[PDB]
């Protein structure tokens, strides 16, 4: 017997088994395609005859065959397990059309025929991992953004906010500015190298303007990084020019409310009676979202814009790159949730819609 946990990040799949602390296998979620279509890094290794593909576009599915095959290869190589003797837990972004839910339910049941299945939003599982009752979740995921005010382990779809800005667009902008600095970054290797440089030295400025003054005056901000070719890159203001775009969509030519502005909008969309508690129950999301000076700066910005009459107690788990998967393992490791699973015969007797009848 085994327990299966499947976390499908915006651009990287990270699966594991209930009770485990970390995913079994992890890798970017890309799909090869011959001009046999291979999976993720498997496809990447064969770039010559396989073309990169992202089934999780916008944080959303594209073609059922693509993730059919990602699961195929997952099971056959990474897990190398027989899930059809174990429950299958899956997660989704909020506001997903019922079409996708029924489609994935049917694909599971027919293609793989696993006994027990169940689905639940990523944000609520991450909150479960965070061990708190009522609050607001910021979904600074990897490909898309959302703001989920969860109450009593229960969320209101209307109150949620959406935005398809995440580490991929941040990396694209950082690549653009680095090229503007006098460098160049075109192919996949360059994209991943830019993401590497970001993950290494990029951080979140406190006072972006005095931060500019210091970067243009204090060269300490300007730092040296060995590129894969060995090239040393001076990186000063650009260490944090991109992250400030999060509060300023104008950085990329986009127009919208900043991240904390978005959060204030969301909390307003809730009921006032518990917005103080929500403030007390901030959240963070995304392994691509732990950059230094981020939690404190966001705390300051909320304290400013959010009325001080309420308590703004931030919550910044430094280990949130897997929050969703960790919460999923925790949930799958609960007694009262075992009953809640959904059997294959239940589908055979009710069809895919049973998921929308029970899977909540």
């Amino acid at each position: 017997i085994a327990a299966l946990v499947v976390d499908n990040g915006s651009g990287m799949c990270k699966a594991g088994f209930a009770g485990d602390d970390a995913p079994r296998a992890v890798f970017p979620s890309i799909v090869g395609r011959p001009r046999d279509s291979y999976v993720g890094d498997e496809a990447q290794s064969k770039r010559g005859i396989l073309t990169l593909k992202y089934p999780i576009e916008h944080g959303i599915v594209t073609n059922w065959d693509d993730m059919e095959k990602i699961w195929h290869h997952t099971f056959y190589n990474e897990l190398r397990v027989a899930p059809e003797e174990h429950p299958v837990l899956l997660t989704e972004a909020p506001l997903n059309p019922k079409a996708n839910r029924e489609k994935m339910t049917q694909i599971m049941f027919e293609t793989f025929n696993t006994p027990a299945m169940y689905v639940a939003i990523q944000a609520v599982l991450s909150l479960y991992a965070s061990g708190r009752t009522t609050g607001i979740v910021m979904d600074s995921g990897d490909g898309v953004t959302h703001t989920v005010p969860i109450y009593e382990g229960y969320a209101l779809p209307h109150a949620i906010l959406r935005l398809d800005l995440a580490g991929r667009d941040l990396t694209d902008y950082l690549m653009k500015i680095l090229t503007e600095r006098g460098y160049s970054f075109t192919t996949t290797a360059e994209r991943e190298i830019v993401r590497d440089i970001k993950e290494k030295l990029c951080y979140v400025a406190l006072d972006f303007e005095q931060e500019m003054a210091t970067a243009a005056s204090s060269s300490s901000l300007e730092k040296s990084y060995e590129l894969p070719d060995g090239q040393v890159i001076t990186i000063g203001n650009e260490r944090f020019r991109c992250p400030e775009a999060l509060f300023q969509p104008s950085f990329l030519g986009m127009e919208s409310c900043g991240i904390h502005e978005t959060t204030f909008n969301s909390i307003m969309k809730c009921d006032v009676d518990i917005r103080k508690d929500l403030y007390a129950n901030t959240v963070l999301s995304g392994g691509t979202t732990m950059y230094p000076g981020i939690a404190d700066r966001m705390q300051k910005e909320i304290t400013a814009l959010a009325p001080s009459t309420m308590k703004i107690k931030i919550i910044a788990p430094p280990e949130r790159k897997y929050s969703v998967w960790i919460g999923g393992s925790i949930l799958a490791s609960l007694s009262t949730f075992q009953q809640m699973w959904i059997s294959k015969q239940e589908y055979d007797e009710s069809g895919p819609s049973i998921v929308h009848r029970k899977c909540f």
């Binding site: 007797e349 009710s350 069809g351 819609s353 049973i354 009848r357």
Partner: protein, 53 residues
């Protein structure tokens, strides 16, 4: 005496976790699933007397 044709409820207990369930009635649901609906009436908080005191 109020005369509600469909709001006819009754007491009973359950098989495995036997206990006074309170005024409840079975009812069909989506996907052809029966569901027990337990009501909430004048004696809701006192659903344990037994022996018809």
């Amino acid at each position: 005496g109020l005369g509600d044709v469909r709001y006819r409820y009754c007491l009973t207990t359950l098989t495995v976790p036997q206990r006074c369930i309170g005024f409840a009635r079975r009812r069909v649901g989506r996907g052809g699933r029966v569901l027990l609906d337990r009501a909430h009436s004048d004696y809701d908080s006192v659903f344990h007397h037994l022996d018809l005191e």
